[PDB]
Design a protein around this ligand. Structure first.
Ligand SMILES: Cc1cc(O)c2c(c1)C(=O)c1cc(O)cc(O)c1C2=O
Ligand SMILES: [Cl-]
Ligand SMILES: [Cl-]
Length: 328
């Protein structure tokens, strides 16, 4: 059957850590005092949680409270451990506390306040300079978590929280994140549709950090071309067709052939034959100010079928695209 695959970076990071670092199931949670926090306003509800603006009365400071809808104790211990492991890293949201909600009878995670503005609200009106700035900020977070043996697996605009006033950015919702263990098969039902990598859409389970680099490419493509979403499928099948209509079918077959993967036969009446399009195709009078040779070279190196050929976060940080961005 399928050919095995392994990350080309940070391959062995968890194999060398102590069990406690990755054996999240065996994590003993440390509970604070729910009384410290007063909920103020419901901000959002997803499939797995409700998010509240709250205040910590024991210091008067604003926090964000995420009350975990019941899902699976593993997934709850998973997110908590990952957040503790990544706490303090560049541009990672900071878990401040964990308390029991008395009404829900479930864990509530308390995070340090971020402004109520996700990236999707602003990423379509940014200057060329700011797209690069904020991409580099996102890259800091991704390389950090990948270096720590963790893939986010749900990179998308809504999961990027941005304080555009203070030019600050946080990567949030680590509820789908997982520890990378070389040779391990993962669930392909992660990420939002538009941001799903081809590996997920062809049901290839032995994926890695590079999945996140595909989603980041989908965000970049959407910002520089002002097309939201860039790959707009009506379902998971058409999503791959949408990608094929840009990257071409010959490279898709080369990919699945490399990994000895067999597409769903559903694809035969739907996929057709498509050439690789040149990126200049998606440039027009309304986005040309956001497009440059460097942008297009960079995007090209992110948006590749073969998850092994994509730029890593760190390589992405080296790209000439970021040379105009002032570094701290
Ligand atoms: C509308 C909205 C506003 C937010 O501030 C957050 C979220 C949603 C959110 O989902 C979220 C998830 C999370 O894991 C950590 C957070 O700080 C958050 C958030 O902070
Ligand atoms: Cl999962
Ligand atoms: Cl990486």
């Amino acid at each position: 059957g399928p050919v095995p695959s392994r990350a080309r970076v940070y391959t062995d990071v968890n194999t060398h850590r102590p069990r406690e670092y990755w054996d999240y199931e065996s994590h003993v949670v440390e509970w604070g005092n729910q009384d410290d926090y007063q909920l103020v306003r419901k901000l959002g509800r997803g499939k797995y949680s409700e998010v509240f603006e709250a205040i910590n009365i024991t210091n008067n400071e604003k926090v964000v409270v995420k009350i975990l809808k019941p899902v699976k104790k593993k997934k709850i211990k998973r997110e908590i451990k990952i957040l503790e492991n990544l706490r303090g890293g560049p541009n990672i949201i900071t878990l401040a506390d964990i308390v029991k909600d008395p009404v829900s009878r479930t864990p509530a995670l308390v995070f340090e306040h971020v402004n109520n503005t996700d990236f999707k609200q602003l990423y379509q009106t940014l200057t060329d300079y700011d797209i690069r700035f904020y991409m580099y900020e996102i890259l800091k977070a991704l390389d950090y978590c990948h270096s720590m043996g963790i893939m986010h697996r749900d990179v998308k605009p809504h999961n990027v929280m941005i304080d555009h006033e203070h030019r600050k950015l946080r990567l949030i919702d680590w509820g789908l994140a997982e520890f990378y263990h070389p040779g391990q098969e993962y669930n392909v039902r992660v990420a939002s549709r538009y941001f799903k990598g081809p590996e997920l859409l062809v049901d290839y389970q032995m994926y890695d950090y590079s999945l996140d680099m595909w989603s980041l490419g989908c965000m970049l493509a959407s910002m520089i071309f002002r097309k939201e979403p860039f790959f707009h499928g009506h379902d998971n099948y058409d999503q791959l067709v949408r990608i094929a209509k840009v990257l071409g079918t010959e490279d898709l077959y080369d990919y699945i052939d490399k990994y000895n993967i067999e597409l769903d036969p559903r694809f035969n009446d739907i996929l057709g034959r498509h050439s690789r399009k040149r990126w200049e195709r998606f440039v027009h009078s309304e986005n040309q100010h956001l497009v440059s040779p460097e942008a297009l070279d960079f995007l090209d190196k992110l948006l590749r079928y073969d998850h092994q050929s994509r730029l890593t976060a760190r390589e992405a940080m080296e790209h000439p695209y970021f040379y105009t961005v002032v570094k701290d």
